[PDB]
């Protein structure tokens, strides 16, 4: 089990994807996910389950929401539902709600329609039950799913709203409700932005810009299969208004559904890499906070990844916030940390010029986070070998001529298994005070990398082999230097 990430979420056994239900209650976060409880493939889809204090530490639950003979459970979120509006608890024991996609089968009395069904738990997810009037809103539809609800108050009313898609359409479709079971159509957005795939797993959240809660903004999250900047699944957003019926976007660049790929690099992306898909946030956390997580794989080789037993693991969670530089709003994303100072070694490189050519750091370096600080000066080039040996390595490099970060997998162990694998992933960073600051996590099957505090991520699976550990720093061309290396493991 060469394989097994040491501080990502994998089930113990057989296949996962999507991430579902993400809701704190009471101190636990649950992470839900779509699941194929009987094997390694994708079918079968049930939520599994897992528990956490922490958002790193989790406990493997037995699956919340399983398939039967009339539907699989695909994606969907969850509410606590505090004053029991949906009547499925009481008030003394109010219901922890999903709004999940039912995908009925040639079986059901609906066949082959995607269409929004309730499950609920009165024990704090610990048992759930389906709703008795499932589906609870339908539109006749093979593929209209994904539903993630939340709260809203303001001039229009205080109801739930629903974020799904019609994913064949490539929208948004908004719906209220006072209860969870009688839906009513707001509005339809887009599509808009990237539109090279089905849209998938959407959100809508308020955050402030820069910590002012004066200056907020709206964010419909939007993923997208395949189509993304990478190639393949992805994960894009939009940043806007939303008026308690409709989403008025502030950062579409082309309306309607794409005419070429000229303005890809401007739509507004999650990540960078080819491997963060799926990606919504958690109900109920206090104070506004924004958390994320992702799918770490992607849909053009997810079945073929070569782990055995398991299939897929999780990102690390991210929290979400909003910042303006040189007047534009955007997202900022930064890992909450896996890898702590009191428990880990630490090994530190201090300030010094870089040759050209390679410095080898004195840390193996496979289950690490690696924070790094570079000023590229006069260099061509700069950056980080990871996860090196004989034959292997993965170049994170940054290139002074373009502006651009690159993560260069094709050399990274395991590429073989398919054709759609290995890759170069690149993202325009800018300098900051002329310095690149990196924060870049590796585990057993994965590189992600944090640039400049969170303004740009780029997440790649990578398949090397046991005895590639190597770590090193590397310069083209003289002029540059190392402001400081830190490994902590």
Known sequence: ????????????????????????????????????????????????????????????????????EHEAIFSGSAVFDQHNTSGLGTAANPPLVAIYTSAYSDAAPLPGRQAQSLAYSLDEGRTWTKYHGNPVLDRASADFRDPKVFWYDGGAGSYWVMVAVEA???????????????WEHLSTFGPANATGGVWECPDLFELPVDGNPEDNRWVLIVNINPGGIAGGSAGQYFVGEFDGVAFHSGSTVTEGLQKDSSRMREYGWLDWGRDYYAAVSFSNVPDGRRIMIGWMNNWDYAR????????????????????RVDGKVMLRQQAIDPLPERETGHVRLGPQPLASGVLDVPAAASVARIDVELEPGAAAGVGLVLRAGDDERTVLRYDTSDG???????????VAFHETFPSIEAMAVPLQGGRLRLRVYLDRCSVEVFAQDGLATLTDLVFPGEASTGLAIFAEGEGAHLVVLDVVG
């Open 1 to 68: 089990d060469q394989y097994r990430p040491a501080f990502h979420y994998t089930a113990e056994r057989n296949w996962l994807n999507d991430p579902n239900g993400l809701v704190y209650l009471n101190g636990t976060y649950h992470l839900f996910y779509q699941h194929n409880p009987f094997g390694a493939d994708w079918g079968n889809m049930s939520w599994g389950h897992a528990t956490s204090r922490d958002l790193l530490h989790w406990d493997e639950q037995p699956v919340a929401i399983p398939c039967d």
């Open 168 to 182: 064949v359409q490539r929208q948004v479709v908004l719906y209220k409700s006072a209860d969870l079971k009688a």
């Open 304 to 323: 073929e990844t070569p782990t055995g037993g398991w299939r897929s693991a999780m990102s690390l969670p991210r929290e979400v916030s909003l910042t």
């Open 404 to 414: 651009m970060l690159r993560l260069d997998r094709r050399e990274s162990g395991q």
